[PDB]
Amino acid sequence: ARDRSYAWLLSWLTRHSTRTQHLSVETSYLQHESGRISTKFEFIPSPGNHFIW
Amino acid sequence: YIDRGIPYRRGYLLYGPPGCGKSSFITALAGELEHSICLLSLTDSSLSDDRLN
Amino acid sequence: TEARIVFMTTNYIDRLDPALIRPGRVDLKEYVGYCSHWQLTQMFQRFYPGQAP
Amino acid sequence: SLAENFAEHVLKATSEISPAQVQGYFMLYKNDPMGAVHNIESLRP
Ligand SMILES: Nc1ncnc2c1ncn2[C@@H]1O[C@H](COP(=O)(O)OP(=O)(O)OP(=O)(O)O)[C@@H](O)[C@H]1O
Ligand SMILES: [Mg+2]
């Protein structure tokens, strides 16, 4: 966790996780193009063993 | 810069009465140059000389 | 961050630095002062509803 | 010509006007150029 590589790899794991069903939630505020902000429900793979292809 | 030994660094200073467009111009310039902004707070509590370097 | 409304109050406006209250940090300054004739009339009418004006 | 008139009137009324104050003044008169060009005197210090 001491490397920026950790941040980039965590982001890539969040994006490319196929249909992984062992996720964890991460709430963030996303500013829409209309000018307002709404809650964004983002799912990060929860701790465990996940398999990709 | 390399061919003359000069360090490859540059710094800019914008000064004037408040509300005249320094921060807004910096944001616009960062947008134009497709750069990002690293906000540094000198008057912090965890900031030391070695940490600043 | 955008989409944000900030309300600030004070009793001594002369103690506020002009950079803190400027058109872009505080977009509206209003004075809430002592009672006036109309204000007293409305307060009386609200506290004792039914009496003659 | 309206922009030139507005600039001249603002410079005549006040001597040191910051762009933030001009932005706020325009914020008051949204979609009303004539109101902006009319009520310069409200900007007097
Ligand atoms: N030249 C300008 N053109 C357009 N908008 C401006 C200009 N100068 C200031 N503003 C507006 O004023 C507000 C605040 O300006 P800004 O933050 O750039 O001021 P500043 O002088 O850099 O002050 P500070 O250093 O305290 O941030 C914003 O709404 C910004 O759009
Ligand atoms: Mg600034």
Curated annotation (Swiss-Prot), chain B:
| Subcellular locations according to the entry | Mitochondrion inner membrane
Q: What happens when the gene is disrupted?
A: Mice show phenotypes similar to the human GRACILE syndrome caused by defects in respiratory in mitochondrial respiratory chain complex III assembly. After three weeks of age, mice develop growth failure, hepatic glycogen depletion, steatosis, fibrosis, and cirrhosis, as well as tubulopathy, lactacidosis and short lifespan.
Where is ATP annotated to bind?
Answer: G16, P17, P18, G19, C20, G21, K22, S23
- Entry superkingdom: Eukaryota
Q: What does this protein do?
A: Chaperone necessary for the incorporation of Rieske iron-sulfur protein UQCRFS1 into the mitochondrial respiratory chain complex III. Plays an important role in the maintenance of mitochondrial tubular networks, respiratory chain assembly and formation of the LETM1 complex.
**Family named by the database record:** Belongs to the AAA ATPase family. BCS1 subfamily.
Q: How does it assemble?
A: Interacts with LETM1.
Q: What is this protein called?
A: Mitochondrial chaperone BCS1
Write down the species.
Answer: Mus musculus
Instruction: Give the gene symbol.
Output: Bcs1l
Give the fragment's position in the full-length protein.
215 to 267 of 418
